Each structure stands twice: as C-alpha cells, then as structure tokens.
From a paper:
To illuminate the structure and mechanism of NS5 proteins, and, more importantly, to explore potential druggable sites for ZIKV, we determined the crystal structure of full-length ZIKV NS5 in complex with S-adenosyl-L-homocysteine (SAH), by-product of cofactor S-adenosyl-L-methionine at 3.3 Å resolution. We were able to trace nearly the entire sequence of ZIKV NS5, except for the first five N-terminal residues, residues 747–748 in the RdRp domain, and sixteen residues at the C terminus. The structure reveals an N-terminal classic S-adenosyl-L-methionine-dependent MTase domain situated on top of a C-terminal RdRp domain. Near to the catalytic site, the SAH molecule is surrounded by a set of conserved residues. As with other viral RdRps20, the ZIKV NS5 RdRp adopts a capped right-hand structure with the Palm, Fingers and Thumb subdomains and a priming sequence poised to receive RNA substrates. The RdRp domain also harbours two zinc ions, as observed for the NS5 proteins of JEV and DENV3.The associations of the MTase domain with the RdRp domain does not involve extensive interdomain contacts, leading to a modest buried surface area of ∼1,400 Å2. Remarkably, ZIKV NS5 superimposes well with JEV NS5, with an RMSD of 0.63 Å over 872 Cα atoms. In particular, the MTase–RdRp associations of ZIKV NS5 and JEV NS5 are both mediated by the same set of van de Waals contacts, involving the C-terminal extension of the MTase domain (P113, L115, Q117 and W121), and the Index, Ring and Middle fingers of the RdRp domain (Y350, R354, F466 and P584 in ZIKV NS5). By contrast, structural superposition of ZIKV NS5 and DENV3 NS5 gives a RMSD of 6.06 Å over 844 Cα atoms, attributed in large part to the difference in the relative orientation between the MTase and RdRp domains. Detailed analysis of this inhibitor-binding site revealed that the critical residues for the inhibitor binding are also conserved in ZIKV NS5, arranged in a similar structural environment; therefore, suggesting that the same compound may also be inhibitory to the enzymatic activity of ZIKV NS5.
The genome of ZIKV is organized into the form of a single positive strand RNA, encoding in total three structural proteins (C, prM/M and E) and seven non-structural (NS) proteins (NS1, NS2A, NS2B, NS3, NS4A, NS4B and NS5). Among these, NS5 is the largest NS protein, containing an N-terminal methyltransferase (MTase) domain responsible for viral RNA capping and a C-terminal RNA-dependent RNA polymerase (RdRp) domain for viral RNA synthesis, with evidence indicating that the MTase and RdRp domains cooperate in RNA synthesis initiation and elongation. In addition, NS5 proteins have been shown to inhibit the type I interferon (IFN) signalling to evade antiviral defence in the host8910111213141516. The essential role of NS5 in viral replication and immunosuppression makes it an ideal target for antivirals.
Numbering used by the authors: 6 to 746, 749 to 887
The structure:
Amino acid sequence: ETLGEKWKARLNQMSALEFYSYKKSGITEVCREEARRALKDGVATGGHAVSRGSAKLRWLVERGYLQPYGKVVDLGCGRGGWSYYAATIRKVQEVRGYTKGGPGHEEPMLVQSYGWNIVRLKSGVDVFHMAAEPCDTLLCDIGESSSSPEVEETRTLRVLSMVGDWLEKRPGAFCIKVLCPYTSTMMETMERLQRRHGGGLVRVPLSRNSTHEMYWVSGAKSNIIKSVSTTSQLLLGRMDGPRRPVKYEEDVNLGSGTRAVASCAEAPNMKIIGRRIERIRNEHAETWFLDENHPYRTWAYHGSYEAPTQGSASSLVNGVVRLLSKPWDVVTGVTGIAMTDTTPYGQQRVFKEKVDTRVPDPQEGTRQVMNIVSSWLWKELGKRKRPRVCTKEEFINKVRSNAALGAIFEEEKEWKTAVEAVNDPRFWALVDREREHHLRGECHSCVYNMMGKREKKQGEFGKAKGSRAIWYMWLGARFLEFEALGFLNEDHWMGRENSGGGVEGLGLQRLGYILEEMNRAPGGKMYADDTAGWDTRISKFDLENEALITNQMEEGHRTLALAVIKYTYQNKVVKVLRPAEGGKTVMDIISRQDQRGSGQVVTYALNTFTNLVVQLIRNMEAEEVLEMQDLWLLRKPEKVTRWLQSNGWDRLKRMAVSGDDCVVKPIDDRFAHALRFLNDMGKVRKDTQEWKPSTGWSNWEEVPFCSHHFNKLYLKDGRSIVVPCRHQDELIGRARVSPGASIRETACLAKSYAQMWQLLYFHRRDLRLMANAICSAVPVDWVPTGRTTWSIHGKGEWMTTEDMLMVWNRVWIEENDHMEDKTPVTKWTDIPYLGKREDLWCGSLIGHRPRTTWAENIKDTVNMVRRIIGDEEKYMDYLS
Ligand SMILES: Nc1ncnc2c1ncn2[C@@H]1O[C@H](CSCC[C@H](N)C(=O)O)[C@@H](O)[C@H]1O
Ligand SMILES: [Zn+2]
Ligand SMILES: [Zn+2]
C-alpha cells in the first residue's frame, strides 16, 4: 500500500463529522453565490460562469500549465464551464464540447458569455463510443468518485484508454482529469503515458480534500511519483491537527457579447447594395455603429444600430389535449416537443452553425453539366407553357389574411395589415417608384427581413430548441417578385403534368399514389436522401442556371426578372437581430450573394427545379454517362445532350420532387454511390459520412417523403386508398403545444388537430379514438383556429365546422382521382386501420394496459373536459 491508499483507507474509516469537517479543510474556494442566484433567476448575460469548473481551468491557464489555442475539445462537457472559459482566450478560435447528459447528468447550459458564438455544445454524446478527431487543444474532465479504490482505478484506466486515441493525433495543449493517480498500477500507467505523451500532473488547490484528483497538463515537467506522493503528503497532513479555514477568491467574470471571427467576406458588389445600405444607415443614423466583434464569417458586415427585441421562447401546453392524452404524459418522445426559441439569441445560435456557411464553387466540368441540364430542363418546362407577367389584381386576390407587411423604411411603414395596404394607392405608388428604379438599373428598397420560425420540435439540452431562420422582403418588393417570376407558381410550371417529376399542388393524400406508381417501374431501390440545409447550398451557379428562364421571355419581362434576380436574388441585403453586451439587442445589416431565402416568392418552384436537375445529374453519374474526370473538365458534352434527349423524361417520371425533398427510383443500385457530382455541387446528403454509399428501400411504403411514409389500405368493400403515416409521437407532441395564445382559443386549436387526425391519420387507432374524444369534449358549434401543419402539402380541409365524414368522402372518394368507384362510405366503421404490426411500429400503444384503461374511462374523462371547457354549451358524442 502506497501513501495514496493510506489516504483513501483512512478516508473510508471516517464518520459524518470527520468527513464533513475534513472536506473543505484548508482548500480554496470561489464565491459562487451570486452566480447560482442569477443562473437560477435566469440572466444569460453578466458574465457568470455556469459551474465551479471554470475556476479550476483558469487557475491552471494563468499559471502556464496550459496554453489553449485554436480548436478546443471539451470531453465530458457537463454544463460546459470549461468550454465557456476557453472561448475567452485570444488565441482560441473554435470550441466544441461533448457530454452524456440525459438522466442524472448535468446538461449543457446556454449563456451569453464573451465568445459564445465559437462554442458548440452537444449533449447525448457517450465519448467512450466516439471516434477521435484532430484538435489543437484537448480537455477532459471525466472521473466519477467511488468509495472503493479498485473502482476508481479501473474507471480511470478506462478514461486513459479512451483519451489515448485522441492523443495520438498530437494535440498542442491538453488537460485531462486523472481521478485516481495514487495506486501502484496507476503510477506505472501514468509513467509510461508520461513517456509517450509528456506533460505532468498538477494538484489544483480548488479541489476538495475528499478526492485525490490531479490534472494531466501539457506545460508541466514534474515527476509522476513525486507529484502524486507529494499531494498525498498534503492531504494526509491535512487529516491531522485542527481544521484550517478556507481561502475565498472572487469568481471569474467572463464578460458578455460575441467574438470577432476570421472572415471569408466575399466582396459584396457595393455598386448594387450601396444605396440600400446608405438608406438603412441614414434611417438609423443616431445609433449606427460598426460592431468590431460581429460573429459573421461567410457574410459581409456593414453596420449595426440599437433596436428592441422580438420573438419569444415560451411554450404553453394545451390542457385539453394533455388531459385527453394521459398515457403519453410519460412518453419522452411526445413530452419533449415544444416551441423553438425565436429570440435574437435563439435564432442566432442556429444561424452561426447552419446558415453562416460558404460552399466552395464546384469544378468547371460540373458547372458545364449543370448549365446543360438546366437549359434542357427549362426548355422542356416551357414546351407548352409561356412566361407571363402577373398583375396587381392577381396579387390582390392572392394576399390573404395572414400575409406580413415587412416594412423596412419609413415610407413602407404606413399600414397595419397587408390587405389594408394593397387597397391603398400610395402603396402601389411605392411599387411604381421602385420599379422605375429597377428599370433604371438600381434598387432602393428590396431589403430582406430575417428572423426565427416558431416551430414545434423536440428540445435540446432539456430546453426549447433554437429557431430555423426565415427571411422575406416587404410587400412591394414581394410584388415585384410576383410580377416577374410569379408565373412559375401561378401557371403550375412545376406541376406533375408539366415538370414530370414534380408534385406541386398535390396534397398529403395523393403523394402515396405517386410513390406506388414509381414502384411499378423496373429498377433499383428507392432513394430519398434529404439534403442538409438546402437553402444554404444554392450556389451562385445554381442562381445563374435558374435565371435561364429570362431567355424564354419577352424583352421587358426579361429585364424585369433580371432586375429582381440580379438586384435581389443574386445580391441579398439582410437585417437581423443579435444580442449585444449588457443584455441589450441590436440590428445587424449584412449582405451575401449565394443563397436562397426562405420567403422568396418562387422558392418552392426554383428549389424543385434545381433538385430535379441534381437528381438527373446523379442518374447520369450512376449510369456511367459521366466519369471521375468530368468534374475538372467535361469531355464531349454531346454525351450529355444525347442522354437527356434520349432518356431524360423517362428519368423525370422516375422521380417525385417537392423542393428540397425528393424520391428517386433509378435504373439500378449504382445510384447509391453516385456521389462525386452530388458532393461537388454542394448538395451534401444528411445523416451520413460524405462518401458512404446511399441506403434505399425495397418497400415503397417505408420510403420517407415530405416527412411521411405511405401505406395502401383496403376498405371493407374491396376498394383501396393510399394514406399518409408518420410516427405518432410527433403528432401528439405537436398537438400538446400552443404558440402563446383563453380556454376557448385553446379548445378550438385542439378541435383543429382532432379533425386533421380524423382526415389524414384516421388509420391510427389511438389518434382516431383521441379525435372522437377531443371532438366529443369540445363544443360542437366552436370553429377551429390555429395552424396544425407547416407542410405545403397540408391544405386545411379540416379547418371547417362541417361534418367530417363528408370531407372524408369528398377527398378520399368524391375528389379522389385514383378512386374510380364513387360509392361513398356511409359509416366510420367501414374505414379500415393499419395493420396491427404496422400500427405498432409507427408508435401505436395498443395492447398496453395503460392505454386500454385510458380507452375504457375515455368517456368519463370526456365529461371531465366538458366540465373544464364550460358546462352550458352544447356537446355531441362522436365516440359512438
Ligand atoms: N461516459 C461519459 N461520456 C460523456 N460524458 C460523461 C460520461 N460520464 C460522465 N460524463 C459527464 O462528464 C461531466 C464532467 S463534470 C465536468 C464539467 C465541466 N468541467 C464544468 O466546468 O462544469 C459530468 O457532468 C458527467 O455527467
Ligand atoms: Zn428594388
Ligand atoms: Zn406507418
């Protein structure tokens, strides 16, 4: 037995009074009182560290034991105080932390300390099953104390086995937690590892006397046994004599704000945007300034001005759906879904990692192939359709109740609602004036608005997730878009009849028929690889190839669409909100040149187009029509125009494309590894290694498309329908949330979900029962409200006070083109369910005792909810 085992053995023989008195005896501490008071109260600014760990690392760094720089990795991230500290050192550029989290472990915390923009914390990571990655600074703080020294030993040997792979990559600075450095085996192991990787062992005064932990740092050259046994001398010494007091030091203040970053700001053609930048600047001249610490990598920066906050992070629960869905109060999948954080911080922290990218320009051969396929496709789409300008009256008849103004300049902010503006002559005077500027070769007000999109998604770090970015221009500039390129949407250019592979206009009830069609054609498996962040992978050359419609128009229409495209789509000026220092928020004016905004009038069209192009090109690489040399320079383009002229349409009919989503049935499975052109075009797949072959489905029913799969069910009378399905937890979870706004206002928002379930997901036993329960518990004469899906394929047939079997017969029998027999179904009892196995697989709960009890007492619970909503309204019994 060594000195360490002496310390641990004497420690184990202690009692409550002994251990409590000994724990903090003579150690050093930081006043973490105001830190936890503010962290519990809320404030994300003010510079408060998220844990005591931040105090350890700093004490090391300021002593020279560690010199952080470059990319930091924080294994065993925890709350992440080590990451948030590292984000402050000047020579640090990027920080990425990983931790287990979940049940029992602390989850990463979200704070706005100086440099939070260079920190990416990921929870749910088990770093013992992680693959090592190169890094310039490696940090580890993993060691769970044990009463037994054997357990502490084997645990620390597990840790030191893990970290080795990371240390082979030769990191410049490192700081590992050694829980048990005192046993003989551990001293030998640390001796050989000290020989191989160097560094030393340091005892931090801030560690409590109840643990022998030491930190393996780079900037130490001490002897292993000398350091370990000297620390054992210190702790054993402290076990004897009177208890000595603690030395208190003020905790570290990490400031607040964001770091400046190395920029790849592509020169922004100041001739195009200078006038708009000047207009914004002069409009807010009193508080215009250049933030020296803006966090924009792949965007240009022009200035900021002080502006109030907007957006919300709150998520309210719909008590009616909750009360009527008890068995899912324990299911993690549905109880974790909530609204996203659309505040400046909540959007920004998704922006910095998902929107502030720059995709490298593809090789020239790929540029040529893209131009050929785009020209051919455009030509094919205009075979029996003609471009045309859309009109003020079409636009007026298209502006609905929920259409946002978007006023940016003083002129544009004169109306409350959109319909109030369109019926005003001064609005169209703004339109005319700006279009005159367009016809003079200028642009003075087509400026984008960016913010976060309130969505119902699963949370991250046990809190509400961040918000996906959405941007759109004000009403007048949107009108100019509609004028120019609106014909794409109005005349259904991308419809299945014209685009061949498109599915524009169709609803959620029809796509499954399309997929069943696609399966009948001979070929390989079906591939529905989604692209990761489409709107950020639309390159300058994709915009080029999409502008090739202007060579299909008359001269005036061409010049109009080439004022929109060039002055807006090819040069984007965006206004965003960002949290500044001291808790205030600010407006940033930025500008880039190579992405597709979410709210461009023709976004679904152009996206579906470019996606068709991409899938065609991939079909070419798969059928060996292209070769690995073709990326650099294309040899014999005629090898392409012949492939397109020969089999192009016969390939488009093998696709179902809806924007970024798509399904492709190729001629064989070579499509699985046709990755060179796909990757070179920036359309990197989702949820895979870049060069791993693609995986597909031999069962057309299991294929994902537009967030659903589709199943063919047979009615009682022999007929058949093809219905959309998804995992039930997303449906109930999405149903249990409310976007901020009486009980009536909620109960209606519940009836909408219940009727949508009665219309689309009637084949999910639980959702049908719960639909009858909600509708039985909600007053009959109450009109539904709210939104139940963001899908462009969710048409809203359920948002009515009309009987539901009527609309079911209408959309599944009467107006069903794939249903030839029109004999309507007379009772809900004749409409089938999914198979019990297929129902279970997608998240059914049938056969489980809890939900059988729920279904038995469902009527009594309905009467309960009738008590809660109101007892003098009229109700109906749909459960029968
Ligand atoms: N197997 C594992 N894989 C990843 N993380 C783990 C893990 N086992 C434990 N952890 C987590 O690693 C964390 C280390 S605590 C260190 C936290 C950080 N240094 C700070 O300043 O707050 C613990 O919270 C623990 O929950
Ligand atoms: Zn303009
Ligand atoms: Zn299913």
